[PDB]
Amino acid sequence: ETLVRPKPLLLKLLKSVGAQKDTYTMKEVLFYLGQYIMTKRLYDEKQQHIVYCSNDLLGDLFGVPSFSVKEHRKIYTMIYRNLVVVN
Amino acid sequence: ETLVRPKPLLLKLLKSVGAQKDTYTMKEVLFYLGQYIMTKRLYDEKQQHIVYCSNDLLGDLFGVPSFSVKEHRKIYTMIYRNLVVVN
Ligand SMILES: C=C1C(=O)NCCN1C(=O)N1C(c2ccc(OC)cc2OC(C)C)=N[C@@H](c2ccc(Cl)cc2)[C@H]1c1ccc(Cl)cc1
Ligand SMILES: C=C1C(=O)NCCN1C(=O)N1C(c2ccc(OC)cc2OC(C)C)=N[C@@H](c2ccc(Cl)cc2)[C@H]1c1ccc(Cl)cc1
């Protein structure tokens, strides 16, 4: 019942998975983003809730990558990937 | 009381802000990451809790960028940056 209009880059992604409209509901945009991710297998094989933005199109939709200092898990994940134990 | 050993890339960042040890406490690594961010001004001017990973060193420490499908705010932020209203 409420339609939105994707900017060109998002429109291209939708069209890449077979959309043909110019305007979409929010549920539609979510469905097609999903489709793009599953069909290109951009999700982690082991933890499928995780999506990699290495794909240029999807990455670009995000804009400059950033994190919040409130994301403690993401920060400690980063730290521990760059540490070793002292024995 | 518990020391960890940064891998070379993290060590370089610490050394870039004046550290000289090879091993650190966790509080120390956090302090120096902080220092790097503030002194290079990688944080958003308007929302200072937000840090951009455009800086190559800091970005690389994170590895391939990813998001979780549980991050609803980050996903809708992305969607709405790529939409306009239909009038
Ligand atoms: C429902 C499913 C779903 O249950 N199965 C796969 C398709 N699928 C799906 O497309 N989605 C999922 C989602 C759930 C579990 C999951 O574990 C493996 C993986 C998911 O799928 C992505 C790995 C492809 N959750 C939705 C969602 C809806 C709204 C919001 Cl703000 C966030 C997420 C949607 C989706 C995913 C990513 C984006 Cl950018 C957009 C939509
Ligand atoms: C305390 C302060 C702090 O209060 N003031 C600035 C220095 N400062 C700081 O260095 N930090 C902050 C932090 C708080 C509010 C804030 O709003 C503007 C900005 C913050 O600072 C970054 C913008 C530079 N919170 C710590 C933290 C500690 C543990 C964890 Cl898992 C997460 C965050 C630490 C910090 C920040 C980023 C990284 Cl990668 C590592 C450490």
Side-chain angles (χ1 to χ4, degrees):
Chain A
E1 174 137 53
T2 287
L3 281 175
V4 295
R5 187 180 302 280
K7 285 176 180 169
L9 200 66
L10 178 58
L11 184 70
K12 175 180 210 188
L13 177 159
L14 302 182
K15 292 201 159 164
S16 90
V17 287
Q20 282 161 110
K21 313 201 278 128
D22 275 353
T23 58
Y24 297 84
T25 63
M26 186 65 73
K27 271 299 182 257
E28 278 176 341
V29 178
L30 293 170
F31 169 97
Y32 285 126
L33 287 160
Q35 178 171 349
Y36 182 86
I37 291 160
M38 300 305 288
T39 59
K40 296 189 72 92
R41 194 172 192 172
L42 304 180
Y43 57 80
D44 180 78
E45 264 63 70
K46 284 183 181 160
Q47 278 190 298
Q48 311 191 352
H49 62 287
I50 305 318
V51 175
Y52 294 113
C53 327
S54 55
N55 175 264
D56 269 19
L57 177 43
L58 192 51
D60 292 358
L61 292 174
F62 286 91
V64 185
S66 76
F67 66 98
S68 162
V69 304
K70 295 183 94 178
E71 305 181 75
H72 289 201
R73 292 176 81 172
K74 161 162 273 204
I75 293 167
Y76 284 113
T77 294
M78 183 275 291
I79 291 166
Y80 273 98
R81 96 182 276 285
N82 292 283
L83 300 174
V84 300
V85 76
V86 321
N87 281 294
Chain B
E1 174 137 53
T2 287
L3 281 175
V4 295
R5 187 180 302 280
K7 285 176 180 169
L9 200 66
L10 178 58
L11 184 70
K12 175 180 210 188
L13 177 159
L14 302 182
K15 292 201 159 164
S16 90
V17 287
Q20 282 161 110
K21 313 201 278 128
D22 275 353
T23 58
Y24 297 84
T25 63
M26 186 65 73
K27 271 299 182 257
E28 278 176 341
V29 178
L30 293 170
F31 169 97
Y32 285 126
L33 287 160
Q35 178 171 349
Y36 182 86
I37 291 160
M38 300 305 288
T39 59
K40 296 189 72 92
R41 194 172 192 172
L42 304 180
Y43 57 80
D44 180 78
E45 264 63 70
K46 284 183 181 160
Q47 278 190 298
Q48 311 191 352
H49 62 287
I50 305 318
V51 175
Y52 294 113
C53 327
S54 55
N55 175 264
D56 269 19
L57 177 43
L58 192 51
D60 292 358
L61 292 174
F62 286 91
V64 185
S66 76
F67 66 98
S68 162
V69 304
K70 295 183 94 178
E71 305 181 75
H72 289 201
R73 292 176 81 172
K74 161 162 273 204
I75 293 167
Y76 284 113
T77 294
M78 183 275 291
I79 291 166
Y80 273 98
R81 96 182 276 285
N82 292 283
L83 300 174
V84 300
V85 76
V86 321
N87 281 294

